[PDB]
Design an enzyme around this catalytic site. Structure first.
Site, PDB file in Angstrom:
ATOM      1  CG  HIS B  62      49.392 107.701 -57.119  1.00 51.99           C
ATOM      2  ND1 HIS B  62      49.328 107.994 -55.991  1.00 51.99           N
ATOM      3  CD2 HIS B  62      50.194 107.637 -57.803  1.00 51.99           C
ATOM      4  CE1 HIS B  62      50.941 108.215 -55.711  1.00 51.99           C
ATOM      5  NE2 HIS B  62      51.146 108.801 -57.387  1.00 51.99           N
ATOM      6  CG  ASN B 135      54.107 109.538 -53.819  1.00 50.82           C
ATOM      7  OD1 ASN B 135      52.969 109.798 -53.909  1.00 50.82           O
ATOM      8  ND2 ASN B 135      55.346 110.268 -54.713  1.00 50.82           N
TER       9      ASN B 135
HETATM   10  C1  HDD Z   1      53.872 114.636 -65.561  1.00 51.26           C
HETATM   11  C2  HDD Z   1      53.067 113.476 -64.771  1.00 51.26           C
HETATM   12  C3  HDD Z   1      53.436 113.496 -63.837  1.00 51.26           C
HETATM   13  C4  HDD Z   1      54.808 113.609 -62.505  1.00 51.26           C
HETATM   14  C5  HDD Z   1      56.208 114.130 -62.900  1.00 51.26           C
HETATM   15  C6  HDD Z   1      53.929 113.116 -61.993  1.00 51.26           C
HETATM   16  N1  HDD Z   1      52.442 112.798 -61.427  1.00 51.26           N
HETATM   17 FE1  HDD Z   1      51.366 112.079 -59.399  1.00 51.26          FE
HETATM   18  N2  HDD Z   1      50.001 111.802 -61.049  1.00 51.26           N
HETATM   19  C7  HDD Z   1      49.692 112.420 -62.111  1.00 51.26           C
HETATM   20  C8  HDD Z   1      51.198 112.307 -63.213  1.00 51.26           C
HETATM   21  C9  HDD Z   1      52.672 112.601 -62.927  1.00 51.26           C
HETATM   22  C10 HDD Z   1      48.542 112.016 -63.053  1.00 51.26           C
HETATM   23  C11 HDD Z   1      48.545 111.041 -64.201  1.00 51.26           C
HETATM   24  O1  HDD Z   1      48.196 113.428 -63.570  1.00 51.26           O
HETATM   25  C12 HDD Z   1      47.438 111.771 -62.101  1.00 51.26           C
HETATM   26  C13 HDD Z   1      46.910 110.549 -61.938  1.00 51.26           C
HETATM   27  C14 HDD Z   1      45.007 110.638 -61.540  1.00 51.26           C
HETATM   28  C15 HDD Z   1      45.485 111.982 -61.340  1.00 51.26           C
HETATM   29  O2  HDD Z   1      44.366 112.990 -60.945  1.00 51.26           O
HETATM   30  O3  HDD Z   1      46.434 113.069 -61.985  1.00 51.26           O
HETATM   31  C16 HDD Z   1      48.892 111.017 -60.495  1.00 51.26           C
HETATM   32  C17 HDD Z   1      47.945 111.032 -59.838  1.00 51.26           C
HETATM   33  C18 HDD Z   1      49.052 111.517 -58.304  1.00 51.26           C
HETATM   34  C19 HDD Z   1      48.533 111.104 -57.229  1.00 51.26           C
HETATM   35  C20 HDD Z   1      47.573 110.415 -56.509  1.00 51.26           C
HETATM   36  C21 HDD Z   1      46.257 111.861 -56.652  1.00 51.26           C
HETATM   37  C22 HDD Z   1      45.013 111.322 -56.194  1.00 51.26           C
HETATM   38  O4  HDD Z   1      45.007 110.391 -54.909  1.00 51.26           O
HETATM   39  O5  HDD Z   1      43.967 110.945 -56.735  1.00 51.26           O
HETATM   40  C23 HDD Z   1      49.488 111.036 -56.088  1.00 51.26           C
HETATM   41  C24 HDD Z   1      49.520 111.385 -54.868  1.00 51.26           C
HETATM   42  C25 HDD Z   1      50.881 111.505 -56.930  1.00 51.26           C
HETATM   43  N3  HDD Z   1      50.680 111.636 -58.213  1.00 51.26           N
HETATM   44  C26 HDD Z   1      51.781 111.993 -56.162  1.00 51.26           C
HETATM   45  C27 HDD Z   1      52.787 112.891 -57.323  1.00 51.26           C
HETATM   46  C28 HDD Z   1      53.916 112.752 -56.799  1.00 51.26           C
HETATM   47  C29 HDD Z   1      54.380 113.327 -54.761  1.00 51.26           C
HETATM   48  C30 HDD Z   1      54.606 113.545 -57.141  1.00 51.26           C
HETATM   49  C31 HDD Z   1      56.472 113.606 -56.917  1.00 51.26           C
HETATM   50  C32 HDD Z   1      56.556 114.189 -57.057  1.00 51.26           C
HETATM   51  C33 HDD Z   1      54.113 112.698 -59.058  1.00 51.26           C
HETATM   52  N4  HDD Z   1      52.825 112.641 -58.614  1.00 51.26           N
HETATM   53  C34 HDD Z   1      54.925 113.004 -60.276  1.00 51.26           C
END
Ligand code: HDD
Ligand code: HDD
Ligand code: HDD
Ligand SMILES: [Ca+2]
Ligand SMILES: [Ca+2]
Ligand SMILES: [Ca+2]
Ligand SMILES: [Ca+2]
Ligand SMILES: [Ca+2]
Ligand SMILES: [Ca+2]
Ligand SMILES: [Ca+2]
Ligand SMILES: [Ca+2]
Ligand SMILES: [Ca+2]
Lengths: 678, 678, 452
Positions: B62, B135
């Protein structure tokens, strides 16, 4: 209170996360009462993540230190010599923060190591933060900033085993000193009592470098900064400093903190020597050379104002650990000189804060924030706290109407380089031959000490050089000391069983200079805050009565009184078990306690001989000692202390005892108790 | 607001350093007018150091996104279903910040990539920050958080050459999808119009996971978050998304920015599905499985409140780039479930902010700070912006009178884990067999699309799979698609020259569900903000009058009107050179401009055939198109656009033309213009 | 040895930049012989930038310490009690690195402070690095890892003035000990001679927690680690320790260095107590409780092998300062228990290395590398020193033929969680009542000392 906007109060309220959700933090979330901890326990992970990341790199040098807030007050309108706003009116007040330090030791090393000391002052001026990043010694080891890692690697611990901590007493340091003769001047200062100051309050501060004062008309003068202690100068003796390092590693920070809390906030006259641009090579050395002082006989001190420290920090980490000083923090009215040590510092202190802070926004930390608005086009970076409203952060612009405007000599009270400064010649990696006399000024310093001061300096060198393994290095050290003084080389050589090389008189002279001697600077101007230990006993209610009466009389005069006895009770501050002569500036025995000084005396409550050892150590380290009440023979005889000795007091009368003893505390040290080479 | 306190105004004043010293920043300090730059130039080094350190790591997923401020307003007191404070009274207002995003692309990649999209909402509640990190697609590709790097490595560019950007159209991605059948449900969503939404405002938000609503009596229910767009659902077509990627990579962030600045801030109803804990396996699938939806036929939506975005940021980096969302930002009244994808997210979003921020104090950034007092024993760390007054930050203590107080179910409105929750069985790295149906719900989704919508999804798969180089990966994809639908596999196979495997009916069914179709979701409820391009000419005064009369008609109804002509002048917004059909939701040709649509038309002011291309592209892509004037047939003949066509308008009258055309803007797309498979 | 490849010899040669360009480093480049220093002096800036950035954060605890290399030698094939490869043959040798420490003091604080001491041992095994991160006292002050910041804030210096250094002799520490009675057992040990040991060689090492030995058949037993000094046990007296802190802050690190240099490298018998899973509550306390010892009268020590330290580091910073221990560095044949102190440690030691190293590739530092091949899909990150040839780093894949392959109980000698482990009950933030006797074992310890 200067940083009150940033304070967080936790005197009430329920525990929250960092985002304000009320939580608990004492038990982990588990799958069952004897089960494994759950990954979904956010309470656990936010608390432990914070804990795991509490530490930041210690400063590359000066890692051990302590700070306080205060105020600078100008004595005059100094417009006639400098445009500096903080100096532009009689009585003008500017908030300050000062940090004092050692140089070589890491965090948690002892305050009372032998070392150079830092004295760093930030003026939060109404035209920007101005820092004078000084030391308690006016001269530096080296003549070019590019050598700083060589010096510091050589004095810091040997890098295979990281031994020894906070000490020059090892082969590498003395190898460096003997191969780099520029080091001799600072080395002689460090080996004097200036290496082991009694407190941060009993040492001076020096800018070391020549700077410029620049008037609004563009004219300049060359200056040296001198912060002259209004507490007096005082030193420890080495054999006291070594015990104090173990008994109280925090001695200097504790002394400063306690002086501020008791309303005895330390003071300095902020002074300069002021000479013309034409006098750069007029004094028999080069004003660009940071290994040289201007003898006060050539240029007297002008008092500019008063520096007073009077408020301790609220959070040490946030204020003291995080304060990031820079000689690049300069204001209109001050300029640099071509001192090649100063020149390189300007780079080092901006770069090194990236290491400490981990990102570029370190000037946003509360302690580093100025007390006036910031207008610039610096943007973004990790940890950015500001929300900038100007969406056109480039110059030149029309879309923000040409703001911010450029500040310079003629507009907006800009900083400006002294406009008479020039350069000429080849682009060179060459040392000026004007820097080549490494020995005359160390001899000037040595000549300006008293005889027992000279002995103390010889004895410090005997101590350290005897611990140098390499016979080659020891010989090289004697070659360099011999160029300053044949007598020093002979007297040092005697302790290490080498012969001194033949006299080499090229740099020998008999000139002296005022104001560098500690032993010579006369009694202390105030005894307030000095520490009196009264050795009493619970075995005699009359001994506790004598101690109470002494306390009242001594506290009246602002002395810090500790009554010592076997056990704590009303009126007793410490036990013998925790007491040591390093905790006092003078020691009084009440004659009702004479029985505790017998060679027979024993108790499970303190180590064998502890009462008498406190008295003996205090005597042998030069302190005023005595026995109050009229029966002095049993104590003084057990201690092998003569009743007729200078700084040895015996009176029945508490009033007479205190009058005499207080003169001894001002004398501070009785130097007749130290043997001299013939 | 912690934001207002940190706003910096640079609309006036002289340039200063970060420590308030007035300076300049346009010329380097040099040794002579043609000389080398000096190291003592602190003005140069502080400015360039800041610049050199402006960047921070992009988000690991993202990375490409855009955010806005707004408000959430509760419709009721929801105490009957949740203790959550922000939901506890009719009309209760809570500030929000939302960021929308793609998933796979880096910073600077195009908004209109085909992707899953983020919709992350922060509620700055009076009991702490609460984030719903959602999402635009309600189901996720994988069933265990440990697999996230496998999915993300596979869809991100191949790691030898970092190709291709922001696309699943490459071997690795389709290798993962074909080997990890859990991916089929999200894959079908991403291959639908949901992969290429018309705007952030024309898509929904989903929590994806089952969460719990927890009452103050400790009772719990299971919930799904649905944010339902009040703007309606709309997609781009793929060819249009491709061109828009090149012509305007900022299309979604510009659309959002502009809607807010025009007073058309987007709205959603924040809804939940609510079901009993006993229903976890009652619907034919497991509510812990994040690859499954609850069909609305089984569990209707309850509307909890209104989300409105209505204020753009001041500084994109400080607010949008630095906002650090976490599912760990939870409040009393909400709880997790044992969804293995949610469970591991809780770890990831705390840890990853250390990478972005470079230090542990990221919650102190203004955009991350709560709106309530913080009371905890977290201390120190790089970038510490607080000055903590409590010098006993440990529990239990007496020296700070036992504060802060532990908060829990009974006291202090503490968060508490739903007290009905249990665990039982072996400590296993086992997948629940209740998770094993990877194909039924992808088929439910496919069955629920209209015929042309099914064709668009087959065509997205034909496009992407035809770019897969490995014949074997392609066969494996067909194996997997065939388990969802034989017809899909046959139709996709036809484009890549392979045979589809024989029908495998194990998971085939004809069930449908409401509310997942875009094409079926009916006309948009509002045409405010939709874009009308009026293609005119400077040649004919009549063309410009026709354009000005349409502009007045259309702007009255909140349409963003662009008049296009050869050159700019009063009333003309855009040249043909900068215009494209991807800039408009509808295109009108004024009949006075007919000469510009001829095959011989040529101009140095725009590319050959540009005016006709804009009209023919708009028509191909399904948009409402028309000629206003009285000739009409000349332009429609040039475009080979049939006058009787649905969403094709021909009126001499401006009034009749606009009434008809605005019904076409609500219809939004004319799907009769896309060919279907036999 | 990944250290051998990284040794740099500077016994000969001309000075170079870090990119191999011969240079000087003794005089700055200036506009004339008395002129200002030039910005174009890259020799100056590369050297001073390095110097300016030499320091890294000290360890959050155990900041003061010293390390050495050596060898562990198994006395037997221990297959009958564990699958651990380093214990699977008589005479099997495994390289080790040990760091000893205090707990509360910063860098530069004295070795002879009164404190708990660390004894952290890395076994560079043929099935991965295995760390036993132990102390010289077998019991810990607290029963739940979430309390560690409370304990450590209370013992470390008061946070307004940062006084006192390396000491519990202040209000906050005794406030915490008196309010949190779990602390009594470790406090009694710390107030004994075990708080001021004569040397690192004259103290034992303890794992503290109950761990599990797991056999290849899946069965498990409960163990305690005891490293028993061959040099004997000895202490300073306090009034001696206080003077020594001042006279030689480096006493323990010099004592260790000198003993290795003289060919008197210190030795320990690496031992376990071994008991059945069914004895978790049989001894009058809970084996999940890290404030309790198993008295040797209830469970005797089994000697598994010899630990010898016999080689000093080459570069203290590179090796000792940068070694990054983790109880998560576990190998097949060992498993955790539900000790709530151990449980939380597993999180802390992985996270804290990000603070110390400044980036995620800390296992690539030579002292942290293993002595077997690394096969995984970890990628990128600041300081990435590898060039990975597998351009399909995702599972499941066909484009890299399914490699790397999953390892588990039945494939590739995988680690596996002891398969008899279970959990039951509510999801609770509750202390087991089995943990509630904070005073009996402190009394047992006190009773067991001599009158002096
Ligand atoms: C195990 C890791 C993992 C899994 C299974 C997911 N994500 Fe995630 N996601 C991340 C690890 C992550 C992260 C690496 O931790 C991020 C990157 C930047 C942040 O702050 O967190 C992230 C970012 C991130 C962002 C952007 C937030 C922003 O605008 O700054 C969104 C909207 C989502 N995720 C949504 C989801 C949804 C709806 C998931 C499943 C239902 C999901 N992610 C599963
Ligand atoms: C070329 C490098 C270099 C040179 C030649 C010097 N220093 Fe320096 N000094 C540093 C590089 C440095 C540094 C690496 O940049 C430090 C470490 C922490 C910091 O902020 O700056 C530092 C810290 C430091 C501090 C501690 C400030 C504090 O309390 O935080 C003092 C008092 C001094 N120095 C004083 C001096 C004086 C009086 C010098 C010669 C006249 C001197 N230094 C030469
Ligand atoms: C929840 C946190 C936590 C708890 C409950 C413990 N520790 Fe720990 N310990 C750390 C968090 C930590 C740490 C913050 O993660 C350190 C700092 C440096 C590092 O690598 O890990 C650490 C370092 C550390 C070191 C230094 C390793 C080295 O020399 O580099 C030793 C020997 C121990 N610990 C031993 C223990 C023992 C025997 C414990 C209890 C039985 C214990 N710690 C509990
Ligand atoms: Ca050495
Ligand atoms: Ca002296
Ligand atoms: Ca690929
Ligand atoms: Ca569609
Ligand atoms: Ca709970
Ligand atoms: Ca305290
Ligand atoms: Ca003892
Ligand atoms: Ca960093
Ligand atoms: Ca397992």
């Amino acid at each position: 209170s200067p940083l009150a906007a940033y304070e967080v109060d936790d005197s009430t309220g329920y525990l929250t996360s960092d985002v304000g959700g009320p939580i608990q933090d004492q038990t982990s979330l588990k799958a069952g009462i004897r089960g494994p901890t759950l990954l979904e326990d956010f309470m656990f992970r936010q608390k432990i993540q914070h804990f795991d990341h509490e530490r930041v790199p210690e400063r590359a040098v000066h890692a051990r230190g302590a700070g306080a807030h205060g105020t600078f007050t100008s004595y005059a309108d100094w417009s006639n010599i400098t445009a500096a706003s903080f100096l532009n009116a009689t009585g003008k007040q500017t908030p300050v923060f000062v940090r004092f330090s050692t140089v070589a030791g890491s965090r948690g090393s002892a305050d009372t190591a032998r070392d150079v000391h830092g004295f760093a002052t930030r003026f939060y001026t109404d035209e920007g933060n101005f820092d004078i990043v000084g030391n308690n010694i006016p001269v530096f080891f080296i003549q070019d900033a590019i050598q700083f890692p060589d010096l510091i690697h050589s004095v810091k611990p040997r890098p295979d085993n990281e031994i020894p901590q906070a000490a020059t007493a090892h082969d590498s340091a003395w190898d460096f000193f003997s191969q780099q003769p520029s080091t001799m001047h600072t080395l002689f200062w460090a080996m004097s009592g200036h290496g082991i100051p009694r407190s941060y309050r009993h040492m001076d501060g020096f800018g070391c470098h020549t700077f410029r004062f620049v008037k609004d008309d563009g004219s300049s003068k060359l200056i040296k900064w001198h912060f002259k202690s209004r507490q007096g100068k005082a030193s420890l003796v080495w054999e006291e400093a070594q015990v104090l390092s173990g008994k109280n590693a925090d001695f200097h920070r504790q002394d400063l903190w306690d002086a501020i809390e008791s309303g005895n906030g330390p003071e300095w006259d902020v002074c300069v020597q002021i000479v013309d641009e034409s006098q750069a090579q007029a004094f028999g050395f080069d004003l660009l050379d940071p290994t040289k002082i201007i003898p006060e006989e050539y240029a007297p001190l002008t008092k500019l104002g008063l520096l007073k420290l009077d408020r301790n920090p609220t959070n040490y980490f946030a204020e003291t650990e995080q304060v990031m000083f820079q000689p690049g923090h300069i204001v209109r009215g001050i300029d640099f000189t071509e001192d090649p040590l100063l020149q390189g510092r300007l780079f080092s202190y901006l770069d090194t804060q990236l290491n400490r802070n981990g990102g570029p926004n370190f000037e946003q930390l509360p302690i580093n924030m100025p007390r006036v608005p910031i207008h610039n086009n610096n943007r973004d970076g990790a940890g950015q706290m500001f929300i900038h409203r100007n969406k056109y952060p480039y110059t030149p612009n029309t879309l923000n109407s040409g703001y911010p405007r450029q500040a310079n000599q003629n507009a907006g009270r800009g900083f400006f380089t002294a406009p008479g400064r020039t350069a000429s010649g080849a682009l060179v990696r060459e040392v000026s031959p004007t820097f080549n006399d490494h020995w005359s000024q160390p001899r000037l310093f040595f000549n300006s000490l008293t005889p027992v001061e000279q002995q103390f300096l010889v004895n410090a060198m005997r101590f350290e050089i005897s611990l140098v393994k390499s016979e080659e290095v020891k010989k090289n050290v004697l070659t360099q000391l011999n160029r300053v003084s044949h007598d020093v080389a002979v007297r040092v050589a005697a302790a290490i069983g080498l012969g001194a090389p033949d006299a080499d008189d090229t740099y020998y002279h008999n000139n002296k200079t005022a104001g560098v001697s500690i032993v010579g600077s006369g009694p202390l101007p105030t005894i307030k805050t000095l520490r009196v230990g009264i050795l009493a006993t619970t075995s005699e209610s009359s001994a506790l009565d004598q101690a109470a009466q002494l306390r009242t009389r001594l506290e009246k005069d602002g002395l810090v009184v500790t009554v010592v006895a076997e056990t704590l009770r009303e009126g007793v501050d410490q036990t013998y078990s925790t007491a040591d002569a390093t905790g006092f500036d003078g020691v009084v025995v009440v004659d009702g306690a004479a029985a505790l000084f017998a060679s027979t005396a024993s108790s499970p409550l303190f180590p064998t001989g502890r009462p008498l050892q406190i008295f003996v150590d205090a005597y042998r380290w030069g302190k005023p000692v005595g026995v109050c009440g009229g029966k002095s023979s049993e104590v003084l005889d057990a201690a092998d202390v003569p009743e007729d000795g200078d700084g040895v007091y015996s009176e029945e009368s508490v009033d007479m005892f205190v009058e005499e003893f207080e003169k001894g505390l001002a004398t501070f040290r009785f130097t007749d108790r130290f043997a001299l080479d013939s």
